[PDB]
């Protein structure tokens, strides 16, 4: 239900069969929804485990396997398919741009506008506004590390709502980073629109 | 060993700080005096040898001879000496007697 | 004056040289483009299938 | 004017009886602060690139002098430091390099920490804590000795999608593999795809 | 240990999952297919906006940045040697333990020679108890080192005069100044001999003051017994065996 | 054994398919060379 | 003066020639680099296996 | 006999693998030629 | 115990698989020692002869 | 190869590790006092036996 | 702006020229104007102006 459709999609995208690739990937995902029995499908994704957020992995970190990680967390598959669709759209747009015809440029404009529409608006840095500068001892504090590990464990196996305030003055943690692929996509679309 | 150790310290320090070769220092001190001691004359000869090498672009032995020293007949002897370089390149027909 | 008229003859002979250079080079260009964009033909997909 | 220096400075340079404890008229050697002031006055009229060249040369000379003085004077117990590379190994910072290279404080710390870890692991530094040296990080030092590899293995968890390969998967069945060879033709016509 | 490893793996998985939910970049039409978990709300109420706080690539505050790599490296490297041993990281480099972690500290570019010189100066000052100027003045007269004496203004003057006019051709074109200056100053400015070096080189060595001169020219650990080895001489002066032969 | 034989069949089939793709890439590169020299001499012509 | 202005036109036309020479040559460069560093592709390792 | 047949199979497999390596080496050499002429004309441009 | 591990090591070194080569050669020798049953191995070499 | 700053730092690390595992090399010592014998002395079968 | 347009001067340079003082405390992430003018590089000692 999942691996073979993208196998065909990747082969078609590599061999420049854009509309066949889109038609084949419509079997797993379609931003315009799905038409079943001549009616709007209520579901968003045409893959049941992806739609239901079903995990089929217990020990993904026992070995170095992004496939196992994605099996443990199913929606990474959704992110991968969405980025593959975005890549297909970008290849369509720049393949239209290649020949520099006026109608081709208009079609590339359409493709890029659609890509922006499905991409939305990107966020910016906010933690760098107020992130403090700690010392090496503060960063390597094993007591702070163990306290954070205990907090994570008690949030994981439980769901306890107590310990409401975590005293953020303990500056020994880091913040997640935005996707380099998404930032590259945004910059590429911006420069294409500028051109 | 203390006095000769200090003498070698002197020689190696001057050679390192001035770029002088051990055989150049040897021929300079031999032309100065057989005692092998360091005085103002040795350093004046080194000064003028370096000065001539910087301006006239002369070899160490050439500048040493020019500032007042004698031609070193007995060089390191693994190659041609200065006396043989000047008057034995090549000997005409007979062995040199000068 | 006759010399420089001959020189003008030289330079426009050279530009004619380069015009027929364009002829030959562009011929190469369409030949190579036709080879590349056609790529693999129905006989070869028949062999593959 | 040729030296680009003041006439009284020229007079001071000429007046230097470099006699150094007799054998001539007298020792007219200036005092330490007089030497410093004279050097400042005679150097004050140079260019900018020459100024940086002099700064770099003086930095290298004082670095070598300080290294020699430390080696000949200060020797902590347990370390037989006798060379520039000995000081390099001890202080985890390079002391025999040029001024052309530029780096950051954190990058220098990375270099020093990595060198110290290598020294401890290779059993060349005595009295190493072999009990501590058998942790997970030192076992994975093959991928922990470089920032790029560590960053990649760290990002593999939070962004596994970047490392997801749509064309192959660890544990892929041989029947899907033969499907891949049967779908990897030059140009994929639709009927061939459904076949 | 199996329990500990499984716990760390589960905690890392949970952190990756919660950051996946809290990523603001996924809005995004796929945001409709993203739900908010009870554990997500628990994390939000526990840590404020920690989950929603993100950083741009290259920021020092990221865990994938070199800052986090260095933090983990120090965490694992703090105990490779006992705190009593001189090989301890803190003992050998106390200045590392209080290193500030700021964006400028990794954005500013500086020569490694500057850091090495500042570390050496810090060690020399904490040992001797003097100032940098006093250290320079003592080094210009020091004797127990192959590099010493080092007269910094003298070296600066020599380098400047070499940069301006080598071989003193301009001075030679003006003979009236040669009647007042002799070859001593010319030797000083051309070759590398400080006044202290000249004094060292022009002092007579006799058995009357042999031990005194040896102690003046060498440290307490430098004895004739140590000097008697040719390899010792080579490794002390940085010379080669044939060169000392 | 004959399954292995058909395996070699598919093997040299896909190998010569990839050879065809290499041929296409080489043709594309040399076509780039052709139009590059075309514009080379286009500018040379106005210079002349 | 007009002659040497035309000569300056000649030389900067030549430097434009060489600029688009850079364009074509660098295009060749990235094409060849992409061919070399990719080397052998998953289809060929599939055939080998 | 069929073991010998699989021997020929491995033989032409490794032979075409080495042919692939020769292709890679030729590509590397001609890429060196490409960037060499790139810097050729880089210096020619500043001369011009 | 000896010839095959360097066979793989030499192949990997020739094919630029540096970390795989190091991991494979760790079976015969490792300057940082060996970790058996979670303890420092007393032996220096992982080949008995 | 790639001449990047981080790559140069990594190469520095590798070379320092290589020096560490290599140690310090010795020099010539027998050439200091090795005598110069004759051909007969070198080919002495009695000495060889 | 007028000085920057004709004399081609930096913003701080023209600001000082029209009557303002040299900004010692710049944005401080890089060299300030005072340090750019009198600390490039400091001769031997720290600046006291």
Author numbering:
A (entry chain B): 1809 to 2003
B (entry chain B): 441 to 538
C (entry chain D), G (entry chain C): 2102 to 2150
D (entry chain B): 881 to 1075
E (entry chain B): 50 to 294
F (entry chain D), H (entry chain C): 2200 to 2247
I (entry chain A): 1809 to 1857
J (entry chain A): 1906 to 1954
Excerpt from the paper describing this PDB structure:
ABC toxin complexes (Tcs) are a class of α-pore forming toxins (αPFTs) that consist of three subunits capable of assembling into a single protein apparatus with the ability to shuttle and translocate toxic peptides into target cells. The two TcAs termed Xn-XptA1 and Xn-XptA2 are the targeting components of each complex and display variations in insect specificity. The TcAs are the largest subunits of the complex and contain a translocation channel with hydrophobic loops at the end allowing for membrane permeation.
To optimize the natural peptide shuttling and translocation mechanism of Xn-XptA2, our first strategy consisted of inserting the pharmacophore sequence of the TATE region of the DOTATATE peptide into the outermost loops of the NDs to alter the targeting potential of Xn-XptA2. We inserted the YWKT amino acids in between Threonine at position 1181 (T1181) and Proline at position 1183 (P1183) with the wt Aspartic Acid at position 1182 (D1182) replaced by the Threonine (T) in the YWKT sequence. The immunoreactive fraction was observed to be 2.8%, indicating no specific binding of Xn-XptA2 YWKT to SSTR2. To test whether the structural integrity of Xn-XptA2 YWKT was intact, we solved the structure to 4.3 Å resolution using cryo-EM single particle analysis (SPA). The structural rearrangement of RBD A in Xn-XptA2 YWKT consists mainly of a significant loss in secondary structure in the form of β-sheets. In contrast, β-sheets in the Xn-XptA2 YWKT RBD A are only observed at positions G328-V335 and I433-P440 with the former regions of β-sheets rearranging into loops. RBD A is ~130 angstroms and 742 residues away from the outer loops of the ND at the YWKT insertion site (P440-T1181), indicating that disruption of these outer loops has an allosteric effect on upstream domains. Comparatively, in the Xn-XptA2 YWKT structure, the narrowest constriction point in the pore has a maximum radius of 4.6 Å and is also compressed by four amino acids from two separate protomers: D518 (Chain A), Q152 (Chain E), Q294 (Chain A), and K291 (Chain A).
